[PDB]
Amino acid sequence: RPTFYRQELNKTIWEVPERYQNLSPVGSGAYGSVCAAFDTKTGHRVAVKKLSRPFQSIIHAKRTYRELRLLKHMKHENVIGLLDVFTPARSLEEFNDVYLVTHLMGADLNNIVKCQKLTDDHVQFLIYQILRGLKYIHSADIIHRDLKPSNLAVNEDSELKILDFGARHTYVATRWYRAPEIMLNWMHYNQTVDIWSVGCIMAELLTGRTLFPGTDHIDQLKLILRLVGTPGAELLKKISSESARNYIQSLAQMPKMNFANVFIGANPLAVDLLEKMLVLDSDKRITAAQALAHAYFAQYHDPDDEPVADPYDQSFESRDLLIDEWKSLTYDEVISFVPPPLDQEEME
Ligand SMILES: Nc1nccc(-c2c(-c3ccc(F)cc3)ncn2C2CCNCC2)n1
Ligand SMILES: NS(=O)(=O)c1ccc(N2C(=O)CCC2=O)nc1
Numbered sequence: 001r002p003t004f005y006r007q008e009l010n011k012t013i014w015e016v017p018e019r020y021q022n023l024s025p026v027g028s029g030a031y032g033s034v035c036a037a038f039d040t041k042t043g044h045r046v047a048v049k050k051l052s053r054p055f056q057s058i059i060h061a062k063r064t065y066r067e068l069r070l071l072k073h074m075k076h077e078n079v080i081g082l083l084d085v086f087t088p089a090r091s092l093e094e095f096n097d098v099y100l101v102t103h104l105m106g107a108d109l110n111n112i113v114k115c116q117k118l119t120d121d122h123v124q125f126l127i128y129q130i131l132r133g134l135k136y137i138h139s140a141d142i143i144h145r146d147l148k149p150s151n152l153a154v155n156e157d158s159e160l161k162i163l164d165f166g167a168r169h170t171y172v173a174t175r176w177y178r179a180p181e182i183m184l185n186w187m188h189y190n191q192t193v194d195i196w197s198v199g200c201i202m203a204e205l206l207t208g209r210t211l212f213p214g215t216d217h218i219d220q221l222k223l224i225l226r227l228v229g230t231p232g233a234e235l236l237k238k239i240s241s242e243s244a245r246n247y248i249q250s251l252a253q254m255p256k257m258n259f260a261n262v263f264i265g266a267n268p269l270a271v272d273l274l275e276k277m278l279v280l281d282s283d284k285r286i287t288a289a290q291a292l293a294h295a296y297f298a299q300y301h302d303p304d305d306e307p308v309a310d311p312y313d314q315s316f317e318s319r320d321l322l323i324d325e326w327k328s329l330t331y332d333e334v335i336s337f338v339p340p341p342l343d344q345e346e347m348e
């Protein structure tokens with residue numbers, strides 16, 4: 001058994017194996033907080049997330065299980081996955097803390113390294129990586145639902161990973177990148193909710209400005225309609241609230257803008273891709289796999305290196321179990337974790 005040590009980080013005691021050294025805080029994550037660390041076994045830099053009160057309630061307990069299951073399944077170069085998972089507990093009866101370990105990424109997309117402005121080739125690379133990660137998670141029936149720059153971890157070489165993907169049950173989050181069907185609680189939607197978000201992110205990389213910086217959900221909707229035009233009646237089918245439908249229907253009709261008049265001087269291929277992503281008709285929205293084939297990414301696209309995921313069993317999501325049952329299932333997942341090899345890639 002490894003020796004653990006205690007260190008106060010973010011005003012609370014972390015208990016970590018001697019393997020991980022020089023911890024220092026690098027911000028909060030979903031339901032936890034994160035430290036950079038040095039892995040003395042491999043000489044690699046890692047990020048360690050300590051979950052916050054993982055078994056305090058039935059909500060925390062199931063979300064702890066959910067996150068550990070999800071991260072144990074994610075094995076893709078543009079998606080956060082696990083190098084390690086640990087607990088100081090020596091038995092289930094002692095088990096009350098969960099730490100997740102992944103490769104250290106320096107920043108998020110808001111902090112991407114650049115020289116004055118991003119070149120189009122660099123924007124291609126950033127968006128390509130998001131879409132490659134989305135193809136993978138979508139193939140396992142996992143949707144992000146809140147994709148945005150702060151949920152894209154980026155390192156010093158602009159390599160990018162999606163994180164905080166895939167909550168059922170209830171900090172002020174930005175809504176500027178959320179798909180309309182999510183922000184307004186429409187009755188149904190598909191995996192292309194995340195493609196809307198990609199469009200919002202890519203637009204901002206091209207212009208340097210937020211695409212839809214609404215002050216509230218009505219202001220944001222108005223900004224959206226000014227770009228994409230007034231929807232048809234069929235879209236009202238998706239909206240439960242009569243007051244919301246009546247309001248939208250009452251708005252003065254707006255024409256769709258030609259995106260070439262909006263993203264001035266952009267690569268025409270970038271404009272065309274944005275036209276395919278920023279669609280209110282989510283059944284006409286391009287999918288991640290389709291976007292990867294778009295000519296905008298021609299210099300990066302490689303079908304042999306755009307894999308899909310193994311099947312992911314989410315049957316647990318429909319189940320209500322007791323707190324100690326989720327805790328025991330989580331403990332099982334900690335104990336059964338098998339670390340990946342340090343080098344899992346080979347030349348093409
Ligand atoms: N610096 C860095 N590097 C990799 C990941 C993270 C990370 C994690 C996280 C997730 C799982 C895991 F096992 C370990 C860490 N959760 C939030 N973040 C950060 C993402 C960038 N903004 C600050 C929080 N942070
Ligand atoms: N990879 S490790 O060497 O840092 C490590 C960390 C923690 C642990 N551990 C647990 O998770 C439960 C009991 C225990 O000993 N084992 C190895």
Ligand SMILES: NS(=O)(=O)c1ccc(N2C(=O)CCC2=O)nc1
Pocket residue numbers: 206207208209262263264265266267
């Ligand atoms: N906010 S804006 O309308 O002034 C604006 C700013 C920047 C841009 N743009 C460029 O300069 C290169 C590509 C692109 O889209 N377009 C519009």
Ligand SMILES: [Ca+2]
Pocket residue numbers: 302305348
């Ligand atoms: Ca290749």
Ligand SMILES: [Ca+2]
Pocket residue numbers: 343344345346347
């Ligand atoms: Ca190799």
Ligand SMILES: [Ca+2]
Pocket residue numbers: 304348
């Ligand atoms: Ca090949």
